[PDB]
Amino acid sequence: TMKGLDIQKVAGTWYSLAMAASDISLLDAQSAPLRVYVEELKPTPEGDLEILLQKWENGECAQKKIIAEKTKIPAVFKIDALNENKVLVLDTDYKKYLLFCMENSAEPEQSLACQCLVRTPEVDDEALEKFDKALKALPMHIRLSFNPTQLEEQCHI
Amino acid sequence: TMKGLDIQKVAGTWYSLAMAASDISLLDAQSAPLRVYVEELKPTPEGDLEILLQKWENGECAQKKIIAEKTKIPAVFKIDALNENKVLVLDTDYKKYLLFCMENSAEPEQSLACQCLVRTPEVDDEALEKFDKALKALPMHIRLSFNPTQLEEQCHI
Ligand SMILES: [Zn+2]
Ligand SMILES: [Zn+2]
Ligand SMILES: [Zn+2]
Ligand SMILES: [Zn+2]
Ligand SMILES: [Zn+2]
Ligand SMILES: [Zn+2]
């Protein structure tokens, strides 16, 4: 988990370039439970974190606003959404990429999903290498990526 | 492509441990067109290669045989497959792992799919690292990894 995280500097728009998870079924279908496309991060003054993302539901992408609550580890947040209860920030440079995981701490290998976010819509090979470097110590069995045209196509339905 | 490959040596039982493809839709469900699980390679006296595999098609785990005809490259075979034209053997050591891709000469990008095969139904980190470096240049938007108790389950789950 990240040390020295300044949550306020992650604010603004983001794109889901890649995602990976501990169980194939968490991401394989367009309707899979952790297939989510992050659009905005909105930190609060108190230091909580609003996550704005799109999820497929009943034929259409739908916006979800997930309130991530501050905890005693600065880069760990508590949630009650998507059947997860934690959001972990692994690393970011604030201006280019951000790596975050979600999991259900009660069954982590059934529930862990990590994403590589980028600030701009392009395939950033260096951000992906950082992502893959973070992932090799995690029990991932599926990894997906989306170029900018593919990402927009996910909700162009 | 591997060079000085000895087809007779690859004969015998194998298990599909990991899979990767250019297009998510080639592998993202059991029903997906290139989700195949290889059971046995059967080299012919004539230098061809019969490939036995399972494929979940309707409600079944269909058993399927594909005949891969020799070409004037020892590591490339012609098939008419699922909708693929070639099987390319990239690397092997006969008794641990074998790496192969399938593609269509007509439109390879929307058709490339590769697999890491192992002889024992064990997760083998060394085979998987060979696979990853074999593929680090290719634009694969889906990569899948199976566990020990999927390796021997019919159509892996
Ligand atoms: Zn709060
Ligand atoms: Zn468990
Ligand atoms: Zn590149
Ligand atoms: Zn595992
Ligand atoms: Zn629509
Ligand atoms: Zn022949």
Side-chain angles (χ1 to χ4, degrees), chain A residues 24 28 141-146 150, chain B residues 24 28 140-146:
Chain A
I24 288 165
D28 54 1
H141 293 274
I142 174 163
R143 181 186 107 124
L144 307 180
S145 64
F146 304 91
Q150 288 146 6
Chain B
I24 291 176
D28 61 356
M140 306 305 246
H141 297 293
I142 176 152
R143 303 165 177 264
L144 295 180
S145 200
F146 298 97

mmCIF file of all heavy atoms in Angstrom, chain A residues 24 28 141-146 150, chain B residues 24 28 140-146:
data_model
loop_
_atom_site.group_PDB
_atom_site.id
_atom_site.type_symbol
_atom_site.label_atom_id
_atom_site.label_comp_id
_atom_site.label_asym_id
_atom_site.label_seq_id
_atom_site.Cartn_x
_atom_site.Cartn_y
_atom_site.Cartn_z
ATOM 1 N N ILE A 24 -11.212 -15.347 -12.482
ATOM 2 C CA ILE A 24 -11.571 -15.054 -13.874
ATOM 3 C C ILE A 24 -12.962 -14.430 -13.933
ATOM 4 O O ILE A 24 -13.176 -13.421 -14.612
ATOM 5 C CB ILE A 24 -11.478 -16.339 -14.730
ATOM 6 C CG1 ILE A 24 -10.021 -16.739 -14.945
ATOM 7 C CG2 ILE A 24 -12.169 -16.159 -16.103
ATOM 8 C CD1 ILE A 24 -9.825 -18.174 -15.454
ATOM 9 N N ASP A 28 -14.603 -11.405 -16.559
ATOM 10 C CA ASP A 28 -14.607 -11.933 -17.925
ATOM 11 C C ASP A 28 -15.786 -11.403 -18.756
ATOM 12 O O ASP A 28 -15.597 -10.995 -19.908
ATOM 13 C CB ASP A 28 -14.566 -13.465 -17.907
ATOM 14 C CG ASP A 28 -15.669 -14.100 -17.048
ATOM 15 O OD1 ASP A 28 -16.517 -13.394 -16.446
ATOM 16 O OD2 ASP A 28 -15.664 -15.354 -16.986
ATOM 17 N N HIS A 141 -5.608 -14.055 -11.878
ATOM 18 C CA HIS A 141 -5.817 -15.020 -12.931
ATOM 19 C C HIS A 141 -6.425 -14.466 -14.201
ATOM 20 O O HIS A 141 -6.618 -15.242 -15.147
ATOM 21 C CB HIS A 141 -6.698 -16.161 -12.421
ATOM 22 C CG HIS A 141 -6.018 -16.977 -11.370
ATOM 23 N ND1 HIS A 141 -5.185 -18.034 -11.676
ATOM 24 C CD2 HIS A 141 -6.023 -16.871 -10.023
ATOM 25 C CE1 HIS A 141 -4.722 -18.556 -10.551
ATOM 26 N NE2 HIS A 141 -5.208 -17.858 -9.541
ATOM 27 N N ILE A 142 -6.799 -13.193 -14.226
ATOM 28 C CA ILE A 142 -7.283 -12.555 -15.451
ATOM 29 C C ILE A 142 -6.733 -11.143 -15.471
ATOM 30 O O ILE A 142 -6.660 -10.465 -14.435
ATOM 31 C CB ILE A 142 -8.825 -12.565 -15.565
ATOM 32 C CG1 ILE A 142 -9.335 -11.751 -16.800
ATOM 33 C CG2 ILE A 142 -9.477 -11.987 -14.311
ATOM 34 C CD1 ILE A 142 -10.797 -12.086 -17.159
ATOM 35 N N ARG A 143 -6.374 -10.697 -16.674
ATOM 36 C CA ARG A 143 -5.870 -9.372 -16.913
ATOM 37 C C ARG A 143 -6.471 -8.884 -18.239
ATOM 38 O O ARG A 143 -6.370 -9.566 -19.261
ATOM 39 C CB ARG A 143 -4.340 -9.356 -16.984
ATOM 40 C CG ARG A 143 -3.816 -7.892 -17.209
ATOM 41 C CD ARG A 143 -2.291 -7.651 -17.465
ATOM 42 N NE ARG A 143 -2.227 -7.335 -18.852
ATOM 43 C CZ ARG A 143 -1.707 -6.264 -19.413
ATOM 44 N NH1 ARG A 143 -1.047 -5.323 -18.760
ATOM 45 N NH2 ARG A 143 -1.816 -6.226 -20.701
ATOM 46 N N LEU A 144 -7.085 -7.724 -18.211
ATOM 47 C CA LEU A 144 -7.706 -7.121 -19.399
ATOM 48 C C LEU A 144 -7.123 -5.731 -19.616
ATOM 49 O O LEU A 144 -6.810 -5.036 -18.651
ATOM 50 C CB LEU A 144 -9.220 -6.949 -19.223
ATOM 51 C CG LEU A 144 -10.065 -8.151 -18.816
ATOM 52 C CD1 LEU A 144 -11.515 -7.741 -18.697
ATOM 53 C CD2 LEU A 144 -9.898 -9.252 -19.823
ATOM 54 N N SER A 145 -7.083 -5.295 -20.873
ATOM 55 C CA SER A 145 -6.762 -3.915 -21.179
ATOM 56 C C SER A 145 -7.612 -3.410 -22.330
ATOM 57 O O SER A 145 -8.107 -4.188 -23.156
ATOM 58 C CB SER A 145 -5.310 -3.732 -21.555
ATOM 59 O OG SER A 145 -5.017 -4.426 -22.754
ATOM 60 N N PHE A 146 -7.743 -2.079 -22.371
ATOM 61 C CA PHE A 146 -8.624 -1.369 -23.282
ATOM 62 C C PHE A 146 -7.877 -0.160 -23.813
ATOM 63 O O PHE A 146 -7.547 0.717 -23.021
ATOM 64 C CB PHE A 146 -9.898 -0.887 -22.569
ATOM 65 C CG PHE A 146 -10.685 -1.984 -21.890
ATOM 66 C CD1 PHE A 146 -10.444 -2.310 -20.572
ATOM 67 C CD2 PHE A 146 -11.650 -2.708 -22.580
ATOM 68 C CE1 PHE A 146 -11.152 -3.352 -19.950
ATOM 69 C CE2 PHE A 146 -12.352 -3.742 -21.958
ATOM 70 C CZ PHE A 146 -12.106 -4.031 -20.646
ATOM 71 N N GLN A 150 -11.498 1.180 -27.505
ATOM 72 C CA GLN A 150 -12.174 0.059 -26.851
ATOM 73 C C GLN A 150 -12.870 0.493 -25.562
ATOM 74 O O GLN A 150 -13.990 0.054 -25.275
ATOM 75 C CB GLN A 150 -11.175 -1.072 -26.587
ATOM 76 C CG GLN A 150 -10.789 -1.783 -27.889
ATOM 77 C CD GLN A 150 -9.366 -2.287 -27.925
ATOM 78 O OE1 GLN A 150 -8.594 -2.232 -26.930
ATOM 79 N NE2 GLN A 150 -9.017 -2.850 -29.083
ATOM 80 N N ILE B 24 -10.321 -9.452 -26.583
ATOM 81 C CA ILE B 24 -10.934 -10.001 -25.382
ATOM 82 C C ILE B 24 -11.973 -11.038 -25.753
ATOM 83 O O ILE B 24 -12.113 -12.061 -25.077
ATOM 84 C CB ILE B 24 -11.554 -8.876 -24.522
ATOM 85 C CG1 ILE B 24 -10.457 -8.001 -23.915
ATOM 86 C CG2 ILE B 24 -12.427 -9.435 -23.450
ATOM 87 C CD1 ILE B 24 -10.969 -6.791 -23.105
ATOM 88 N N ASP B 28 -13.048 -14.600 -23.601
ATOM 89 C CA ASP B 28 -13.644 -14.093 -22.366
ATOM 90 C C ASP B 28 -14.795 -14.930 -21.789
ATOM 91 O O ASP B 28 -15.305 -14.575 -20.727
ATOM 92 C CB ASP B 28 -14.161 -12.659 -22.564
ATOM 93 C CG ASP B 28 -15.251 -12.565 -23.632
ATOM 94 O OD1 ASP B 28 -15.572 -13.590 -24.288
ATOM 95 O OD2 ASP B 28 -15.779 -11.454 -23.826
ATOM 96 N N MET B 140 -1.782 -8.023 -26.340
ATOM 97 C CA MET B 140 -2.786 -8.974 -25.896
ATOM 98 C C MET B 140 -3.677 -8.276 -24.870
ATOM 99 O O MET B 140 -3.203 -7.903 -23.799
ATOM 100 C CB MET B 140 -2.098 -10.204 -25.290
ATOM 101 C CG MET B 140 -1.086 -10.865 -26.190
ATOM 102 S SD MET B 140 -1.730 -11.335 -27.813
ATOM 103 C CE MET B 140 -1.636 -13.080 -27.708
ATOM 104 N N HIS B 141 -4.976 -8.165 -25.160
ATOM 105 C CA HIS B 141 -5.908 -7.460 -24.284
ATOM 106 C C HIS B 141 -6.589 -8.403 -23.304
ATOM 107 O O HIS B 141 -7.388 -7.949 -22.493
ATOM 108 C CB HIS B 141 -6.992 -6.713 -25.090
ATOM 109 C CG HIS B 141 -6.438 -5.630 -25.987
ATOM 110 N ND1 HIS B 141 -5.850 -4.485 -25.496
ATOM 111 C CD2 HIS B 141 -6.392 -5.524 -27.330
ATOM 112 C CE1 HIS B 141 -5.437 -3.730 -26.495
ATOM 113 N NE2 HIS B 141 -5.734 -4.351 -27.621
ATOM 114 N N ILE B 142 -6.333 -9.702 -23.401
ATOM 115 C CA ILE B 142 -6.829 -10.651 -22.413
ATOM 116 C C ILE B 142 -5.763 -11.702 -22.162
ATOM 117 O O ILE B 142 -5.182 -12.268 -23.093
ATOM 118 C CB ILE B 142 -8.175 -11.296 -22.820
ATOM 119 C CG1 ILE B 142 -8.594 -12.342 -21.789
ATOM 120 C CG2 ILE B 142 -8.114 -11.880 -24.224
ATOM 121 C CD1 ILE B 142 -10.112 -12.521 -21.715
ATOM 122 N N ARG B 143 -5.521 -11.968 -20.879
ATOM 123 C CA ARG B 143 -4.617 -13.023 -20.455
ATOM 124 C C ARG B 143 -5.282 -13.736 -19.291
ATOM 125 O O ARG B 143 -5.847 -13.074 -18.405
ATOM 126 C CB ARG B 143 -3.272 -12.472 -19.996
ATOM 127 C CG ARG B 143 -2.525 -11.645 -20.995
ATOM 128 C CD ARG B 143 -1.419 -10.895 -20.273
ATOM 129 N NE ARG B 143 -0.564 -10.103 -21.163
ATOM 130 C CZ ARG B 143 0.600 -10.523 -21.659
ATOM 131 N NH1 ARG B 143 1.050 -11.741 -21.368
ATOM 132 N NH2 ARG B 143 1.321 -9.715 -22.438
ATOM 133 N N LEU B 144 -5.229 -15.071 -19.309
ATOM 134 C CA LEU B 144 -5.945 -15.922 -18.366
ATOM 135 C C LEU B 144 -4.976 -16.969 -17.819
ATOM 136 O O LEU B 144 -4.032 -17.365 -18.501
ATOM 137 C CB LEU B 144 -7.153 -16.631 -19.035
ATOM 138 C CG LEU B 144 -8.344 -15.851 -19.575
ATOM 139 C CD1 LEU B 144 -9.370 -16.799 -20.184
ATOM 140 C CD2 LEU B 144 -9.030 -14.967 -18.556
ATOM 141 N N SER B 145 -5.192 -17.357 -16.549
ATOM 142 C CA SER B 145 -4.313 -18.228 -15.763
ATOM 143 C C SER B 145 -5.222 -19.158 -14.966
ATOM 144 O O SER B 145 -6.200 -18.687 -14.372
ATOM 145 C CB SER B 145 -3.459 -17.378 -14.797
ATOM 146 O OG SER B 145 -2.328 -18.043 -14.361
ATOM 147 N N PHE B 146 -4.938 -20.465 -14.969
ATOM 148 C CA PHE B 146 -5.820 -21.449 -14.359
ATOM 149 C C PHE B 146 -5.095 -22.135 -13.193
ATOM 150 O O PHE B 146 -3.863 -22.222 -13.160
ATOM 151 C CB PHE B 146 -6.301 -22.484 -15.387
ATOM 152 C CG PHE B 146 -7.102 -21.887 -16.480
ATOM 153 C CD1 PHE B 146 -6.511 -21.563 -17.671
ATOM 154 C CD2 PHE B 146 -8.447 -21.583 -16.299
ATOM 155 C CE1 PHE B 146 -7.254 -20.931 -18.673
ATOM 156 C CE2 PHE B 146 -9.191 -21.011 -17.305
ATOM 157 C CZ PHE B 146 -8.593 -20.685 -18.493
#
